[PDB]
């Protein structure tokens, strides 16, 4: 099925994950109750700049409006290509209009992969060939848009999250959308903000009672979605089989990564607290199980898993979604009823996804 749905439950202290303008924890109100939140872009940057990302998907695309710095890097890395001036020219054509070196300033921050720039440097030969008028060259490369996308097998993140060109030539050729939709990460449960201390201190003194609800480590629900077909389009036409591999890398990262020098709370005991992957015709998110919920029994994770599972049952039956589904749970809870394969470790789930839910 065209869409792969990734549902993750990951626990870690609410802590220092992502911050507000006044350096307060980001939150969101859901079901009328406050939730700790992690912005999609923060999760995404944590992924792009991850160690695992560097090894298993390659080098991250570099975002910047500093053109002077980029000239320097581009001339350095593309120095083997005979001229610097042509490099300057291609940059000037993609974005208008640069001088040496100087502080000129891109319209807005846009992700530069070096590969495509190199490819454009390869293409500008046609400038001397025809010699093609720059507009003519644009029309000619406008004809074959897919050709540039192949360069995105480096810079994949652009294929996943997409870029927006506001000016120059990159607007005609550089418009990439999709392919990954990722939710903001919200807690399954209440954590409570701005508690009246004046009245908080009333409860404290027992004084003879000497006696509540247990302590707790947070538990976040993360959602992500990938449009395999759009991803394939974004890579310039690529095997499905490869796109699913990219997706599995995304699954692992979504299951394990936490921003800001933090780890999952049970990161030493296993790879993932909960992970489900599901294939579908239409994207579906399971956030609603956590609109009512979740009240703690001992911990939040166990009832979170349960609530999620029950909601999945209800949804699956109600909307009649036959889809390939696979779940990784270490917590033994009343598991799902309908057609989900249970996977003992994360790699098996990844493998299951790699072979298209076979």
């Amino acid at each position: 099925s065209n869409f792969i749905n990734i549902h993750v439950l990951i626990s870690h202290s609410p802590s220092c994950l992502n911050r507000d303008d006044m350096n307060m924890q980001k939150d969101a109100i859901f079901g009328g109750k406050r939730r700790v939140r992690i912005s999609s872009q923060s999760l995404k940057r944590a992924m792009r700049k991850s160690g695992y990302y560097a090894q298993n998907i390659g080098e991250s695309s570099l975002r910047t409006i500093h053109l002077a710095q980029l000239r320097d890097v581009l001339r350095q890395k593309l120095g083997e290509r005979f001229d610097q001036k042509i490099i300057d020219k291609t940059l000037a054509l993609l974005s208008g209009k640069s001088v040496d070196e100087e502080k000129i300033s891109a319209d807005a921050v846009t992700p530069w992969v070096v590969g495509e720039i190199a490819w454009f440097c390869e293409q500008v030969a046609k400038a001397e060939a025809d010699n093609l008028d720059d507009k003519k060259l644009l029309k000619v490369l406008k004809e074959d848009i897919a050709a540039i996308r192949v360069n995105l097998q480096q810079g994949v993140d652009i294929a996943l999250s997409g870029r927006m060109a506001t000016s120059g030539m990159m607007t005609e050729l550089g418009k990439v959308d999709g392919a990954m939709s990722i939710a903001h990460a919200i807690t399954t449960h209440q954590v409570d903000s701005d508690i009246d201390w004046f009245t908080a201190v009333d409860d404290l003194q027992e004084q003879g009672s000497a006696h509540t609800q247990e302590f707790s480590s947070g538990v976040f629900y993360r959602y992500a979605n990938i449009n395999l077909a759009q991803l394939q389009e974004n890579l310039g036409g690529a095997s499905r089989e490869q796109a699913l591999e990219i997706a599995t890398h995304v699954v692992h990262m979504l299951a394990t990564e936490v921003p800001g020098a933090k780890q999952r709370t049970y990161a030493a005991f296993n790879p993932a607290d909960m992970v489900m992957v599901n294939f579908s015709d239409m994207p579906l998110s399971m956030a609603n199980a956590f609109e009512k919920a979740v009240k703690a029994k001992d911990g939040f994770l166990q009832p979170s898993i349960q609530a999620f599972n029950q909601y999945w049952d209800r949804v699956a039956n109600g909307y009649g979604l036959n889809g390939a589904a696979a779940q990784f749970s270490l917590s033994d809870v009343d598991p799902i009823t309908a057609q989900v394969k249970q996977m003992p470790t994360l790699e098996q789930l990844k493998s299951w996804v790699r072979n298209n839910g076979e």
């Binding site: 609410p14 006044m22 350096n23 201390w197 302590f215």
Partner: protein, 195 residues
């Protein structure tokens, strides 16, 4: 042990230095109280949470809204919510060569701005009284004040989190005496609460 909510007329709470000097008139000499700025300015003045060993007396510049007599009986190994505005710093001398008083090189406090240093600082100052199970350190923007008559700055950190009690009297002591420097500038008031 007295915890109060207090408002200070704006025309008497313009500088951070004035604020304590203004709460000073609630009494009654060494200082025996801590306070926490809840709302800096409103049209009726500045709002504050004042912990002290004596009942505050209302004035025409400092008004008590409500006061409570509270005695602190804390259980061991039970988790608590805490808030603490503090001035985590490091005393050092001196990137500049400047000197003062008896002519030896000057010492100056600098704010601890790296998160790990802050959490370390907090768990350090608490020590055996409690375990910091969870803490978010909020960087607050630097506060400035006037003399009298001198020019100084105070960058503050707001620790909000959960802790666990190891030793009770230690913790009540830490509550009563305050945590960290700048207690006269609205720092050091450890506010506790149940889950």
């Amino acid at each position: 042990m007295y915890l109060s909510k207090v408002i200070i007329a704006r025309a008497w709470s313009r500088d951070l230095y004035q604020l304590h000097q203004g709460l000073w008139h609630l009494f009654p000499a060494a200082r025996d109280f801590l306070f926490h700025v809840e709302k800096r300015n409103t049209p009726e003045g500045c709002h504050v949470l004042l912990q002290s060993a004596q009942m505050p007396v209302s004035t025409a510049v400092a008004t008590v809204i409500k006061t409570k007599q509270v005695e602190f009986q804390l259980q061991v190994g039970v988790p608590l919510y805490f808030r603490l505005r503090a001035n985590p710093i490091k005393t050092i001398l001196d990137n500049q060569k400047r000197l003062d008083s008896k002519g030896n090189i000057k010492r100056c406090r600098v704010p601890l701005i790296k998160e790990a240093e802050q959490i370390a600082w907090l768990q350090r100052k608490l020590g055996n009284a409690a375990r910091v199970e969870d803490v978010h350190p909020i960087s607050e923007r630097p506060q400035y004040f006037s003399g009298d008559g001198k020019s100084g700055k105070i960058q503050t950190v707001c620790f909000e989190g959960v802790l666990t009690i190891n030793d009770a009297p230690a913790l009540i002591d830490l509550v009563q005496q305050g945590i960290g420097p700048a207690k006269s500038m609205g720092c050091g008031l450890l506010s506790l609460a149940p889950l």
